[PDB]
Amino acid sequence: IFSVDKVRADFPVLSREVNGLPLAYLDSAASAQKPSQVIDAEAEFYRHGYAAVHRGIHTLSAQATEKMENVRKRASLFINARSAEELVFVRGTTAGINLVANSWGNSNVRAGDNIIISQMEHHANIVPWQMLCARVGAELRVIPLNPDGTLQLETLPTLFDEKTRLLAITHVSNVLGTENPLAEMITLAHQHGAKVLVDGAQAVMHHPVDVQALDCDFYVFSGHKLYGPTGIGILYVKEALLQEMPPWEGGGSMIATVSLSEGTTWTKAPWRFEAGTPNTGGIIGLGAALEYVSALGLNNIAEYEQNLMHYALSQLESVPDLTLYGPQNRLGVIAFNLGKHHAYDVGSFLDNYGIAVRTGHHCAMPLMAYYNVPAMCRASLAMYNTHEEVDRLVTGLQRIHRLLG
Amino acid sequence: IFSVDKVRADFPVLSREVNGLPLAYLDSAASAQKPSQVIDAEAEFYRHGYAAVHRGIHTLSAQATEKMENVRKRASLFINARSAEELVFVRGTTAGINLVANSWGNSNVRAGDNIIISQMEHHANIVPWQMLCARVGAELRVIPLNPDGTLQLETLPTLFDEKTRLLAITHVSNVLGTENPLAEMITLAHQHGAKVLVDGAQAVMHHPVDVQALDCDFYVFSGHKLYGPTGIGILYVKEALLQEMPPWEGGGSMIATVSLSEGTTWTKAPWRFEAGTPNTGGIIGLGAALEYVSALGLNNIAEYEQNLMHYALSQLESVPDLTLYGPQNRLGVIAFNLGKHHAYDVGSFLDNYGIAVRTGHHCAMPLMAYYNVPAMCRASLAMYNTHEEVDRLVTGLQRIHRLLG
Ligand SMILES: *Cc1c(COP(=O)(O)O)cnc(C)c1O
Ligand SMILES: *Cc1c(COP(=O)(O)O)cnc(C)c1O
């Protein structure tokens, strides 16, 4: 069983005061706080083992290269990929999607084809496909939403045909907390020869993820939302697909050969897609974050988080004129608006109480437009958040409603 | 005046032992060790101030955004850029050059134009231009080398004409240590309406750099070679140029607006070119590295490093059958080969003595081909290296020559 008090003791930021009051950090969906196990692992690498990593001859460089490839292996086991060589180190989810859209997209999506996304996607899983479709002369199709924040699955027969090359779909909405039925949608996409990219940036911290079970063709997520450092993410690609993908960004570490007269050759994938000096510090930190999460146990995390979410939704019933967006079974995040008050004002009062929520469009303007609002508030309920923090949120919304009503 | 013993005490890795012997780290040109001022600044941000940075409403996010923009300002002052908004945070020098080659290159280099590089360039400042020229139907021209490792400047009349759109040129060679005469080459390029990108990745740690004095149009360098964290670099672009450059990689943080029916608009530059969550941890560390270097004083650093280099070149005269490559007045690095022994074997013996040098082509295969060798050894002599470490290198080469000769 899970002990939130023991977990919280690992996170030094949670002792912080904001506005003279104890911090209630309810914005882990934008970025997660990091335990000292992760902070110190990166710091210790810099203090005692630092070097460049291009299988350099000398000992520090050789050992740093081994550490980095060990993290790649650890990450592949974390998502149950079949091979470590199916994972690419990327700057984050946004860059991973741009990499797929350029390298794979440019050579596999042609004039008259279509790509399917959903109306709940983060901008990072929309704009690369808009740009690709424009470059290539293809059509971007959109799975629409139901009022409860789930996809209108009944529209899939109208969107999938023999010209559908790709479904790009979020695992878990960063706004609504909706978990989409990936395994079944992937089966349908594969019946038409379409590949599937899964945006897993809001999934990998909430429960186990198994890309062989899912059978997805691409899977992306960001380290900094997985209690890890900034500047590092993971792109999983099926080996058979990845080994055919052409280069993207160019230079050292990714070339095999450079000639001014004979041109340039490229090295094998996954390294083909990691140009320049990698973010070795962030990779060390990410490995430590995976070890930390695996030690707690993702099923223990999920159980505690589901209990906290059930408690929050129960308690929020006592807030007058509160509008919630999304399904009853949401993961991770609660999107809401208070009466007719603008989200910006609600979040400002909450911050004044020491409570950190996010306001605005959450990088999902088409989702805001579907609900006919310009913005929402969003509270994340992560594994280090508590019932008492939920009580502070509920009381704060009650006070705000009484003060501004 | 500079005190190497005080400086070295700031760098915890320099106490390391390699192979049971005290480390002599002579590979700072591949990547620099970091002082605890830099390591701890990043760690403290994670421990006490961490949050997402997209001018979030709540206090931690607002303060993190301010910290990041303060580093941008500090970096602009470090290179004497006129405005902080002329600097883009990039993954490193390689990504910065790829950004210029795609965004600026694709809309300013047309069929029948030419681009000029030199024969001493790092692959990162070659391959993006090869790819651009192929995309666009332009010609890549090359300034050749002299035997002493300087550019054949007399060839410039044959390479520059009214169709030259860009000169892409290294400030300091990562192999030879040659410092190129940028100010004069930039004047000539500008007479033809050509822009100039300067690869400054081996310059910014050795002496002051002033991009207004240089009048370069683009300037790039990497944090991890400037005693800073991995995963972060700086791209400087003249404001008038940068404000016309179209987007590159797409998603949140760089869009102004996303609509599924009306398309997408982009935000203003510099932020236009920073898609996704930035590497906030690395940006904090980079700011601390700039403060640390500025506190030591770049002119004090240059004076000490020049003295160390003069001592090394003097002492290396006592190594039999040593071949040095490059000019007498080199900065930072000494490239060499020992007799007919392969560089890999020489570097392996040096590593066995605890001495870290780099071997191989150094991401400069055309430079290796010019000298008709497959590889070289390279020792870097940075601000924390000592006369005693130079003595260990000289003795080691003597022992290797005696043992394998
Ligand atoms: C280090 C180096 C690069 C590449 O920089 P990264 O940090 O690996 O992207 C480019 N040019 C020169 C001269 C270099 O020394
Ligand atoms: C965080 C987020 C992204 C963007 O990830 P970055 O780390 O900012 O690149 C993409 N998709 C979803 C669902 C997200 O929550």
Among A247, A279, A296, give the residue marking a domain's end. A296
Residue with the nearest Cα to atom 12 of ligand 1? B201
- Evaluate whether residue B95 is within a structural domain: yes
Residue with the nearest Cα to atom 2 of ligand 2? A201
Q: Which residues line ligand 1 (CB under 6 A)?
A: A 276-277; B 92-94, 122, 124-125, 170, 174, 199, 201-202, 222, 225, 233
| Chain B nearest-CA residue for A264 | B127
Among A267, A296, A325, give the residue marking a domain's end. A296
Angle separating helix axes B387-404 and B298-316, nearest 10 degrees = 30
Whether B163 and B203 share a structural domain: yes
- Evaluate whether residue A405 is within a structural domain: no
Whether B198 and B319 share a structural domain: no
Inter-chain contact A251–B97, Cβ cutoff 8 Å?
yes
The residue among B70, B382, B379, B336 whose CA lies nearest residue B225 is: B382
Contact B45, B284 (CB under 8 A): yes
Whether B153 and B230 share a structural domain: yes
One-letter amino acid of A203:
A
CA distances from A113 to A110, A137, B67 (A): 6, 8, 45
Whether B102 and B8 share a structural domain: no
Residue span of the structural domain in which B378 resides? 2-36+297-400
Whether B287 and B331 share a structural domain: no
Method: X-ray
Q: Residue A106 is encoded by which pair of tokens?
A: 């440019």
- Evaluate whether residue A338 is within a structural domain: yes
For A296, the enclosing helix (H) or strand (E) is helix A280-296
CATH code where residue B52 lies: 3.40.640.10
Whether B288 and B305 share a structural domain: no
CA distances from A347 to A28, A326, A379, B63, B404 (A): 15, 19, 10, 16, 72
Residue in B93, B171, B279, B363 to alter for ligand 1 test, most ligand atoms within 8 A of Cβ: B93
Q: Are strands B218-222 and B233-237 parallel, antiparallel or unpaired?
A: antiparallel
Query: Residues of A numbered 137-156 whose beta carbons fall under 8 angstroms of chain B's beta carbons: which are they?
Result: 140, 142
Inter-chain contact B358–A229, Cβ cutoff 8 Å?
no
Among A271, A296, A321, give the residue marking a domain's end. A296
Which neighbouring-strand residues pair with A245?
none
Inter-chain contact B252–A124, Cβ cutoff 8 Å?
yes
Whether A242 and A102 share a structural domain: yes
Q: Is A162 helix (H, G, I), strand (E, B) or coil?
A: coil
Whether B222 and B323 share a structural domain: no
- Evaluate whether residue B186 is within a structural domain: yes
Contact B258, B268 (CB under 8 A): no
- The full DSSP string for A36-90 is HHHHHHHHHHHHHT----SS-SSHHHHHHHHHHHHHHHHHHHHTT-S-GGGEEEE
CA A338 – CA A383 distance, rounded (Å): 25
Q: What is the CA radius of gyration of chain B?
A: 22
Q: Residue B404 is encoded by which pair of tokens?
A: 């394998």
Using the CB atoms, write b or e for A200-238: b if 16+ within 10 Å. Answer: bbbbbbbbbbebeebebbbbbbbbbbbbbbbbbbbbbbb
Q: Residue A320 is encoded by which pair of tokens?
A: 């007058």
**Shortest Cα distance from B254 to chain A (angstroms)?**
10
Contact B78, B294 (CB under 8 A): yes
In this complex, how many residue pairs, one in chain A and one in chain B, have their CB atoms less than 8 Å apart? Answer: 283
Inter-chain contact A230–B281, Cβ cutoff 8 Å?
yes
**Shortest Cα distance from A50 to chain B (angstroms)?**
7
Q: What is the CA radius of gyration of chain A?
A: 22
Whether A310 and A271 share a structural domain: no
- Evaluate whether residue B180 is within a structural domain: yes
The residue among B202, B220, B1, B217 whose CA lies nearest residue B95 is: B220
Residues of B forming the active site: 363
Query: Residues of A numbered 220-279 whose beta carbons fall under 8 angstroms of chain B's beta carbons: which are they?
Result: 222, 224, 229-232, 249-253, 255, 257-260, 263-264, 275-279
**Shortest Cα distance from A90 to chain B (angstroms)?**
10
- Evaluate whether residue B405 is within a structural domain: no
- Evaluate whether residue B99 is within a structural domain: yes
Q: Residue A52 is encoded by which pair of tokens?
A: 């460049």
Whether B305 and B252 share a structural domain: no
Q: Which residues line ligand 2 (CB under 6 A)?
A: A 92-94, 122, 124-125, 170, 174, 199, 201-202, 222, 225, 233; B 276-277
Q: How many domains does chain B have?
A: 2
Phi-psi region of B363 (alpha: psi -120 to 50; beta: other; left: phi over 0): left
- Evaluate whether residue A107 is within a structural domain: yes
Residue with tokens 């996303």: B258
Phi-psi region of B92 (alpha: psi -120 to 50; beta: other; left: phi over 0): left
Q: Is A144 helix (H, G, I), strand (E, B) or coil?
A: coil
Whether A318 and A290 share a structural domain: no
Inter-chain contact B249–A98, Cβ cutoff 8 Å?
yes
**Spatial CB neighbours of A120, under 8 Å, sequence gap ≥ 6:** A145, A149, A151, A170, A173, A175, A176, A178, A364, A366, A367
Whether B272 and B321 share a structural domain: no
